[PDB]
Amino acid sequence: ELSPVALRQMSCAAGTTQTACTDDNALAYYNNSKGGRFVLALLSDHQDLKWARFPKSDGTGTIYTELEPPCRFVTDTPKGPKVKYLYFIKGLNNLNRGMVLGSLAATVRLQ
Amino acid sequence: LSPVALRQMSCAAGTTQTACTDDNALAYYNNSKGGRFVLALLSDHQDLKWARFPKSDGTGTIYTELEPPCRFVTDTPKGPKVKYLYFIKGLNNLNRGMVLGSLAATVRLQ
């Protein structure tokens, strides 16, 4: 009983389809774990996303990870309230869903 | 399930209900239905089994049983320190995640 495990954020492309994945639509939550970047969830202004795309640094090619239907929530910002959408990755177990929700809620002021 | 603010308060804890003194620990909680839902405790202390929480109506007080703690290290300015994370008995994994993700944000986790 001792407890590791860091939660990082890169920006990334996302879209309603795979070829629609464009231009850093979003913020991906991830872990470094195992054989590369392991993505937990996406944060976006956009409400209609189905995929996220991650070119591998390998150079093999690209990963598309399917998104779950999003949560609506509202944050207080210096520019007033902004509505964002949180997308868990298809089949995220609950511990990992809990990590994302808890980090948001700890760092971001919510209406 | 959308995110809920997770707050921190000071609280008493101990090896037994009676031994819950002045404030030993820091509890992580939600508000909900008026009931503060306590999720976990943080303590320097190694040997805790119970936390105590006076309901703020002064109707009474709640003792919630703690799980066996996790050791972890935060680094403070006087070097690394060992603290213990106590989930509440029966906390589901979702809320375990929440606590762990809030720990990373609120505590210098070395």
Side-chain angles (χ1 to χ4, degrees):
Chain A
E1 263 146 39
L2 218 33
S3 51
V5 208
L7 214 224
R8 261 263 143 171
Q9 277 153 230
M10 64 191 277
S11 73
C12 65
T16 28
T17 69
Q18 289 189 177
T19 46
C21 287
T22 253
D23 277 15
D24 299 6
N25 255 2
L27 230 236
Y29 288 89
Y30 72 96
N31 281 349
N32 283 316
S33 70
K34 276 34 159 266
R37 287 176 187 219
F38 169 70
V39 178
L40 278 75
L42 294 209
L43 231 186
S44 195
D45 303 339
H46 291 96
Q47 94 194 314
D48 263 307
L49 314 173
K50 175 195 162 208
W51 301 89
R53 159 183 78 201
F54 300 83
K56 234 321 157 236
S57 29
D58 258 282
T60 48
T62 117
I63 309 201
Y64 293 91
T65 67
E66 191 168 346
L67 277 10
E68 284 191 352
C71 280
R72 249 255 265 153
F73 70 99
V74 173
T75 60
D76 300 341
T77 79
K79 279 168 92 175
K82 301 307 211 205
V83 6
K84 333 287 281 295
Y85 290 92
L86 170 69
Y87 297 84
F88 291 115
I89 256 135
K90 191 192 135 179
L92 245 212
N93 53 96
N94 292 330
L95 204 61
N96 280 330
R97 263 160 225 245
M99 229 103 31
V100 176
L101 291 168
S103 166
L104 266 167
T107 58
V108 141
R109 281 284 236 119
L110 318 135
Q111 152 188 111
Chain B
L1 245 124
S2 69
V4 189
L6 194 98
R7 297 194 178 76
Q8 272 119 70
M9 64 183 250
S10 319
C11 67
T15 24
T16 82
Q17 281 170 213
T18 313
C20 290
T21 328
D22 206 4
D23 289 348
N24 278 254
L26 222 243
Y28 287 63
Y29 67 97
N30 289 151
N31 293 302
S32 60
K33 339 108 116 228
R36 304 175 298 195
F37 176 43
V38 177
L39 300 232
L41 293 197
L42 237 55
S43 202
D44 302 341
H45 309 298
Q46 355 63 33
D47 55 331
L48 305 178
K49 272 279 169 111
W50 286 99
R52 124 162 183 288
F53 295 106
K55 282 189 274 173
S56 66
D57 45 19
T59 255
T61 132
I62 300 178
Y63 293 80
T64 78
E65 205 174 309
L66 270 16
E67 240 152 49
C70 308
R71 203 159 52 190
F72 71 97
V73 190
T74 57
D75 72 13
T76 87
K78 328 254 56 92
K81 205 187 135 46
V82 161
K83 311 270 256 138
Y84 304 89
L85 206 228
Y86 298 82
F87 299 115
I88 282 314
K89 245 238 140 310
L91 235 220
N92 76 25
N93 282 339
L94 176 66
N95 285 320
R96 256 193 203 74
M98 295 198 221
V99 173
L100 282 173
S102 197
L103 226 229
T106 59
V107 145
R108 286 188 63 207
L109 226 26
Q110 210 186 199

